[PDB]
């Protein structure tokens, strides 16, 4: 029983049925439709670079407020315009418009640490130096 | 309470109640 062919000479049916089934996966279908090369905002890339369009104050709530905001950036190689969560406070005095930031992915979303509705990108570098050293006062952002 | 009628894609009658109330594709070489 058990639904499937089990005969010694029925390998062709097993292969074809498995091929259609594997097409009904998710990782496999994303890999062979090649949407990382056609529909993904990054070109299948891990990091990317972009020119900062503008910045918008997507704030949690009103006067009693937790200040976690995001920028609007435009990619260079693709031209698609996305949103990026800048790290810890005070760095928006550091990044302005048109600074050629370097972006990555964000990661997990749980109860905390950023539950922003539809922001999967974090600004890793700004002006081609960093955010960590430029927040820990190791290096300084050069002018233009 | 009644158990809700279960289906994957919504039934045609409920589709009627909800709805009442071009160019070809591309294949780049």
């Amino acid at each position: 029983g058990k639904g499937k062919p089990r005969g010694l000479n029925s390998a062709r049916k097993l292969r074809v049925h498995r091929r259609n089934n594997r097409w009904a996966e998710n990782n496999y279908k994303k890999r062979l439709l090649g949407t990382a090369f056609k529909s993904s905002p990054f070109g299948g890339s891990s990091h990317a670079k972009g020119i900062v369009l503008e910045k918008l104050g997507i704030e949690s709530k009103q006067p009693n407020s937790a200040i976690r905001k995001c920028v609007r950036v435009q990619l260079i190689k693709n031209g698609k315009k996305v949103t990026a969560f800048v790290p810890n406070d005070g760095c928006l005095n550091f990044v302005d418009e048109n600074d050629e930031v370097l972006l990555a992915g964000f990661g997990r979303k749980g109860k905390a640490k950023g539950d922003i509705p539809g922001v999967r990108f974090k600004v890793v570098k700004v002006s081609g130096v960093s955010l960590l050293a430029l927040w820990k006062e190791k290096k300084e952002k050069p002018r233009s | 309470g009644h158990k809700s009628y279960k289906s994957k894609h919504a039934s045609k009658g409920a589709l009627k109640r909800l709805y009442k109330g071009g160019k070809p594709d591309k294949q780049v070489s």
Binding site: A112, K113, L131, L132 | -
Partner: protein, 35 residues
């Protein structure tokens, strides 16, 4: 809503029978600041 989530979800483990460290002014905050 870190305080409400943690204080609600640390009581369910008390019913399930597991140890939970007692709360103070150190639990519901950014323990580590971001970049």
């Amino acid at each position: 809503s870190a305080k409400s989530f943690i204080l609600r979800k640390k009581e369910l483990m008390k019913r399930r029978g597991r140890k939970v460290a007692k709360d103070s002014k150190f639990t519901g905050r950014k323990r580590r600041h971001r970049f």
